[PDB]
Write a protein that binds this ligand. Structure first.
Ligand SMILES: CNS(=O)(=O)c1ccc(Nc2ncc3ccc(C(=O)N4CCC[C@@H]4C)cc3n2)c(C)c1
Length: 288
């Protein structure tokens, strides 16, 4: 068990537990080791076979004592730190394009196996110095749920939550991850979060003030959803030229389709990979 791992240093804190850089004494490997204090065993075990170059590899599940240990491949840094480092200059658009293209590939793979993430955010998008970006903590939400506060009581962010989740749908689809990635795409471009809400209703109303309050025309069935209130204010939609300047029209077209209100109209990961915005996509080397 854990005797085979030498903790090197603490590198993060998830909603469920703490993450260490560790050395596997048996293999020589450097890994990221997450310790969770305590159906899950089977669901998490399934995730070990969800291998893709844009998914952080789950190397091992160790179940000993009242604790679950997940061993991951080690990556250099997360996208949140990189965005913060690029606050003055911005991430170059070719690199933005490459990151979005790679994450959509990851998403199309997971979604094809009917796995959703449900909690995408810059902090679980991890990068290396080659130019790769990978989705992390994939599928761990279906096991335990997404809490209001982490095990350290930090507030879990709502900024990337799709509107059908915020409106109280409990049987939502892969489209929720397309929404989250669209919010992240916009944030890389503008260097500001698109919808930085600090409560569920503040989050919902920020979406409404930019994209228009949804109605039965743009989203059939919306007015019957669990948390929908007829007393919601009615705001007009803004034009994307105001939302993400200076993204070109291909990028604005793609972003608008990732942010469609109706989950059934929202673009899939697979159709997004065919969008003309990626006609000239390349794999640049980032400056970390
Ligand atoms: C501190 N921000 S950093 O300074 O830029 C930063 C971020 C990540 C890592 N590397 C890393 N590698 C694999 C992981 C695999 C999984 C996890 C993990 O369980 N999570 C739960 C919360 C979010 C994260 C995905 C973290 C990993 N973290 C490093 C060395 C630095």
């Amino acid at each position: 068990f854990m005797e085979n791992f030498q903790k090197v240093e603490k590198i993060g804190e998830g909603t469920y537990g703490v993450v260490y850089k560790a050395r596997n004494k048996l293999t020589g490997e450097v890994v990221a080791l997450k310790k969770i204090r305590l159906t899950a065993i089977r669901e998490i075990s399934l995730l070990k076979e969800l291998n893709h170059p844009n998914i952080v590899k789950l190397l091992d599940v160790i179940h000993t004592e009242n604790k679950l240990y997940l061993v991951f491949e080690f990556l250099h840094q997360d996208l949140k730190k990189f965005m913060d480092a690029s606050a003055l200059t911005g991430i170059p658009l070719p690199l933005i394009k490459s990151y979005l293209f790679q994450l959509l590939q990851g998403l199309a793979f997971c979604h094809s196996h009917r796995v959703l993430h449900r909690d995408l955010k810059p902090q679980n998008l991890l990068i290396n110095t080659e130019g790769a970006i990978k989705l992390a903590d994939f599928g761990l939400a279906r096991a335990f749920g997404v809490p209001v506060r982490t095990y350290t009581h930090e507030v879990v962010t709502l900024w990337y939550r799709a509107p059908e989740i915020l409106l109280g749908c409990k049987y939502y689809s892969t489209a929720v991850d397309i929404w989250s990635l669209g919010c992240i795409f916009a944030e890389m471009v503008t260097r500001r979060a698109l919808f930085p809400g600090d409560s569920e209703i503040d989050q919902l109303f920020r979406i409404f003030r930019t994209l228009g309050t949804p109605d039965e025309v743009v989203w059939p069935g919306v007015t019957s959803m669990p948390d929908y209130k007829p007393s919601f204010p009615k705001w007009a939609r803004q034009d994307f030229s105001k939302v993400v300047p200076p993204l070109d029209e291909d990028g604005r077209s793609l972003l608008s389709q990732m942010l469609h209100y109706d989950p059934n109209k929202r673009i899939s990961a697979k159709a997004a990979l065919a969008h003309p915005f990626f006609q000239d996509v390349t794999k640049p080397v980032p400056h970390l």
